[PDB]
Amino acid sequence: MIHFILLFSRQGKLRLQKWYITLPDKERKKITREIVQIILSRGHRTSSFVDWKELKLVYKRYASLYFCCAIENQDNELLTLEIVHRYVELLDKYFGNVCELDIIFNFEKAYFILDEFIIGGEIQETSKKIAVKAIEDSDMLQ
């Protein structure tokens, strides 16, 4: 299960955040700052895997804005990367040429897509088209 997922920009600004662990607000902010500092203080050949606080922190940013996850030491590491790539592809398909500008304005849509895709740190839909159809149907409800 994914302990937390945070979408942080290259400048350090966070465009998305979804933590599956009930933590204090100050503690959550400190953890996010530490994760940003570690990721922001990492090179391009670090393997995109960090063991921070015994958590498999995997970083794989496809643009200026990076992505982060908190995976416990009980599952494979490539599965998290595959899930992140699938989520990025689904978000791009739902939005259409998803860029940084649309992420800030359409943060609610991204949060709804993440909720409909992953719940509680675990996956909810392995397919990429069924989730998109469900999201479109939910949006069309008004």
Binding site: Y62, A63, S64, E89, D92, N97, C99, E100, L101
Partner: peptide, 10 residues
């Protein structure tokens, strides 16, 4: 800028 670029460019 660097923000208008697509996340995956697909």
């Amino acid at each position: 800028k660097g923000e208008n670029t697509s996340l995956l460019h697909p």
